Design a binder for these strands. Structure first.
Ligand code: MG
Ligand code: MG
Ligand code: MG
Ligand code: MG
Ligand code: MG
Ligand code: MG
Ligand code: MG
Ligand code: MG
Ligand code: MG
Ligand code: MG
Ligand code: MG
Ligand code: MG
Ligand code: MG
Ligand code: MG
Ligand code: MG
Ligand code: MG
Ligand code: MG
Ligand code: MG
Ligand code: MG
Ligand code: MG
Ligand code: MG
Ligand code: MG
Ligand code: MG
Ligand code: MG
Ligand code: MG
Ligand code: MG
Ligand code: MG
Ligand code: MG
Ligand code: MG
Ligand code: MG
Ligand code: MG
Ligand code: MG
Ligand code: MG
Ligand code: MG
Ligand code: MG
Ligand code: MG
Ligand code: MG
Ligand code: MG
Ligand code: MG
Ligand code: MG
Ligand code: MG
Ligand code: MG
Ligand code: MG
Ligand code: MG
Ligand code: MG
Ligand code: MG
Ligand code: MG
Ligand code: MG
Ligand code: MG
Ligand code: MG
Ligand code: MG
Ligand code: MG
Ligand code: MG
Ligand code: MG
Ligand code: MG
Ligand code: MG
Ligand code: MG
Ligand code: MG
Ligand code: MG
Ligand code: MG
Ligand code: MG
Ligand code: MG
Ligand code: MG
Ligand code: MG
Ligand code: MG
Ligand code: MG
Ligand code: MG
Lengths: 56, 134, 76
RNA sequence: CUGGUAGUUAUGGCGAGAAGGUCACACCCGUUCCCAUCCCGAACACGGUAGUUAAGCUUCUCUGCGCCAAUGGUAGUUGGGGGCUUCCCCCUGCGAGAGUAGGUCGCUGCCGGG
RNA sequence: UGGGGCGGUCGCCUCCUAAAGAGUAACGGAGGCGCCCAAAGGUUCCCUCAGAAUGGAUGGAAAUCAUUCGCAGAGUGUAAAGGCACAAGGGAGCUUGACUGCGAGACUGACAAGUCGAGCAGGGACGAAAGUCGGGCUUAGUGAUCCGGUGGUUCCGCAUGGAAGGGCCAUCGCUCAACGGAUAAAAGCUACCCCGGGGAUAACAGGCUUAUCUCCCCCAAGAGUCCACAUCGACGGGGAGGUUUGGCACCUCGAUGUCGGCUCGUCGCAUCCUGGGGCUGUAGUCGGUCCCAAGGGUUGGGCUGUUCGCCCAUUAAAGCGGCACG
RNA sequence: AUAGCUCACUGGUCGAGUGACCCCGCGCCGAAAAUGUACCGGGGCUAAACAUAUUACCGAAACUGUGGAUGAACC
RNA sequence: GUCAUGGAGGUAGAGCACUGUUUGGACUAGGGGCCCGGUUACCGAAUUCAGAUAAACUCCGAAUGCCAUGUACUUAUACUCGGGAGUCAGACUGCGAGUGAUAAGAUCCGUAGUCGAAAGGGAAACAGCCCAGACCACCAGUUAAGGUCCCCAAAUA
RNA sequence: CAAGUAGUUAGAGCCCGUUAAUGGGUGAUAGCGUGCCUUUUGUAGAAUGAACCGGCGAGUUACGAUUUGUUGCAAGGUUAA
């Protein structure tokens, strides 16, 4: 398991940025979800790593 | 002045001058060179003036190599003409020089006269330069 | 002034089906002038050099010798 | 061992040098016949085995040309952030072209004779 | 349509722009089309180009033969691109598939239209056979409807039988080229002008830009009797200003009055005079050039609407610019 | 031109460093306009500027805390 | 949306194998002269050695983007039919190009953002730049860009 | 002694007493703050309209078409003059 927190806003970000964040399950700012450690999830995270905080 | 004898197309795009020189960074023919430090357009008139200044100082001893040629041509419009109605008419020839390119070489003269001739030539060009050895 | 100014309209050439896609017979796979892609197995060359599937199957863009390509359709 | 017939991006090609055989295949001898030359039995076709491996062919050696090809580095660039913005710099991931180490005088299948 | 006019263009095909799928604009950069072929189409069989070198000739650099090298340096009806030597290139024999009814399924696409197509039936051409043939190596070579003309037709035919007339199938008549074609049929002046609108769009002024313009510098060949730098400074290079000629079309068209003169000034300094200095190719008087300096000063007339400019007579001097050309 | 000074050099006094060249960081000149300082917002600053590193705090209608109103989906 | 796998496509870059442009050297088959065919450099075509250049050059060739397959992991739409519209003057900023002069708050395309239709905090003031999306009330708290000598909340760290 | 889209938030002082409730009037001083409409890429706009107040002043009706909702009957439904 690992913890995902959206710390930066999506205003001013391109569409793939927003679609990836919206597919991760994050809503408003400072929102938290718990996922697993698949290669797909890490592939998402490396794409929007500048908008997010990752924790176990 | 160096001008091509024939051209396939009369009008040409202006291009760009990003990056280092593709080739010619290293002196090969002579043993003294004038290397460009930044990128600029060099016209054939400036090349002729620089060559004349370089040669006159050496008293026509030694040898000179010109490592650039004005392949590209540029156009221009008259005064009082609005925008539109085609492209202008060609006026001159330029050689887009990228940084790191060596454009003049000298051989057959000692340190002092070679360095002074290159210094004299470098003041006719619109680009910052430096002197290199082989 | 401006003796130029004319151009034709684009003919939408290119590839119309992907590698590994199930394809129905008779459907176009590549529109092209001349022969950039040769017809392989179960595909045919048209009048204006298009390639079409002659049977249902799976598209496979394969390679002939050093500098040529071909496309073929394999029943599942 | 050879003749025939396929697959494989030339690592399979080109070039140079040597050897062998009518068992096969060849060159070879002839034009009455089937057939043929904008003329020519050169070729195509037909009919035979006197002679010879000179050539094809087959085998053997090479890097001379060619072809294949790393590792490392560099150019470029998706994403993020800055400058003094003809342009330049930093972080992360991807990563050529040229050059080179090196490889190569092929590798597999089936049928008939010996 | 970088205001309108003058000039040019208006439909179709090929390449670059075009940012490695498709698509993509400009009065952007280059070219072609409004046909041709009775074989330059179909099929069967066969083979191979440009150029160079040497050998002889009338005949030469180049005409026709001979040997060698020769992966395309040729050709492919025609513009370009893509392709093609297992020919799509070149010869010969026979022929007319340059066929009739069609068509699963796709591409393109707002519509109208446009493109490809295996396979089925009828009847054939070439080939021994397998098999190929619904024009040409592939993409231009073309315009709807309405209305008329010609050929065919087991369709209708206004009481019935006919007929006139219509329908259906095949085909013909457009520089309708402003090429999705307003009608079968069409040019100019307006300063005598009028209405509806627009700062969506021009003339003045402002704004952005600084090619041009004014001014200042860098290098230094040279002129200066010698001596580059007292004074000029070629060939080239770098800036500042926002006074010129321009570029753009951001405010103003329910109104921002335009040139010159008069009255009244005020500001900048890149200083015309006066003040203080350095160098001089400064003997003196008079000068040249640069540096600091904006305190005050900076004429009256002839010609022209003139700004400007030339001229007359003076003066210590008769400065250059900004302020909606104050 | 000869002249005057004087170079290369030598002999002495002296007592320890003295030469050019290349690269990088930050600065200097080049640097001029029109109502009034007028190219840090002002005062003012020799750090209250610049470079690298660290730690606290301020700072939005963002997020959270408490109380209300309301839409959709599903129970 | 990401991951794994398979494809089509010649841009950036690079290169000279074709096509144009081009520099130096040796030989140049020659032309003209000084000549008695030599001297040839005054030019020398082909060949070759080396070194350059290209939007309409390519023996090569990425990063991204695109088309699919999946049974992988997340996530909430996609399509068809019908009723009703408005829109067809766009602007600036970053990046890739054309025209222009590699001028313009210029003009015309590709791509992303913001304004248009968006208040709030920072750039003194400031549609388009940086942070960030206002259901209402509170004399509560933590942070973003930007800041902490005084105007002016917070370090004369 | 003051630089003001005239208000709003904080607020002393003075004067009152209500549909009785964390009430009313005025406000020294402090922070923030460039009217309404129209038309626009964009207006506080030096772009348009309005002196102020009151009244009047702009998607309606008839006959057809189509689609949704409701009611009656249903292989039938329904009348017009
Ligand atoms: Mg085209
Ligand atoms: Mg055909
Ligand atoms: Mg055809
Ligand atoms: Mg490599
Ligand atoms: Mg494309
Ligand atoms: Mg693309
Ligand atoms: Mg034409
Ligand atoms: Mg032909
Ligand atoms: Mg042929
Ligand atoms: Mg068929
Ligand atoms: Mg038949
Ligand atoms: Mg048949
Ligand atoms: Mg027969
Ligand atoms: Mg008509
Ligand atoms: Mg009758
Ligand atoms: Mg025409
Ligand atoms: Mg059309
Ligand atoms: Mg008539
Ligand atoms: Mg009027
Ligand atoms: Mg305007
Ligand atoms: Mg006018
Ligand atoms: Mg006027
Ligand atoms: Mg103007
Ligand atoms: Mg004005
Ligand atoms: Mg300027
Ligand atoms: Mg002289
Ligand atoms: Mg000059
Ligand atoms: Mg102007
Ligand atoms: Mg515009
Ligand atoms: Mg006006
Ligand atoms: Mg008015
Ligand atoms: Mg001065
Ligand atoms: Mg003076
Ligand atoms: Mg004086
Ligand atoms: Mg004065
Ligand atoms: Mg008189
Ligand atoms: Mg004045
Ligand atoms: Mg005025
Ligand atoms: Mg005036
Ligand atoms: Mg002043
Ligand atoms: Mg909220
Ligand atoms: Mg709550
Ligand atoms: Mg390139
Ligand atoms: Mg709908
Ligand atoms: Mg339109
Ligand atoms: Mg438009
Ligand atoms: Mg646009
Ligand atoms: Mg550009
Ligand atoms: Mg611009
Ligand atoms: Mg614009
Ligand atoms: Mg939005
Ligand atoms: Mg805002
Ligand atoms: Mg704000
Ligand atoms: Mg500012
Ligand atoms: Mg503010
Ligand atoms: Mg909200
Ligand atoms: Mg805090
Ligand atoms: Mg006072
Ligand atoms: Mg008072
Ligand atoms: Mg009160
Ligand atoms: Mg609008
Ligand atoms: Mg406007
Ligand atoms: Mg006013
Ligand atoms: Mg109006
Ligand atoms: Mg009014
Ligand atoms: Mg109505
Ligand atoms: Mg009912």
């Amino acid at each position: 398991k690992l913890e995902i927190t959206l710390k930066r806003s999506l205003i001013g970000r391109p569409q793939p940025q927003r679609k990836t964040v919206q597919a991760l399950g994050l809503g408003k700012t400072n929102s938290v979800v718990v996922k697993e450690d698949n290669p797909a999830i890490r592939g998402m995270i490396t794409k929007v790593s500048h908008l997010v905080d990752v924790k176990e | 002045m160096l001008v091509p004898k024939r051209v396939k197309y009369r009008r040409e795009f202006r291009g760009n001058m990003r990056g280092r020189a593709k080739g010619g960074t290293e002196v090969a023919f002579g043993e003294y060179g004038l290397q460009a430090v930044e990128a600029s357009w060099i016209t054939n008139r400036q090349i002729e003036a620089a060559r004349i200044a370089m040669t006159r100082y050496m008293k026509r001893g030694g040898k000179v190599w010109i490592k650039i040629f004005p392949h590209k041509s540029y156009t221009s419009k008259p005064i009082g003409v609005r925008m539109g109605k085609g492209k202008g008419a060609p006026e001159g020839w330029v050689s887009p020089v990228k940084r790191g390119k060596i454009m003049f070489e000298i051989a057959g003269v000692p340190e002092d006269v070679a360095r002074e001739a290159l210094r004299l030539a470098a003041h006719k060009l619109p680009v910052k330069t430096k002197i290199v050895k082989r | 002034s401006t003796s130029n100014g004319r151009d034709s309209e684009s003919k939408r050439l290119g590839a119309k089906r992907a590698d590994g896609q199930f394809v129905t017979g008779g459907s176009i796979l590549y529109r092209q002038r001349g022969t950039k892609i040769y017809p392989g197995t179960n595909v045919g060359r048209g009048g204006d050099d298009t390639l079409f599937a002659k049977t249902d199957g799976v598209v496979r863009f394969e390679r002939m010798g050093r500098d040529k390509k071909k496309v073929s359709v394999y029943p599942e």
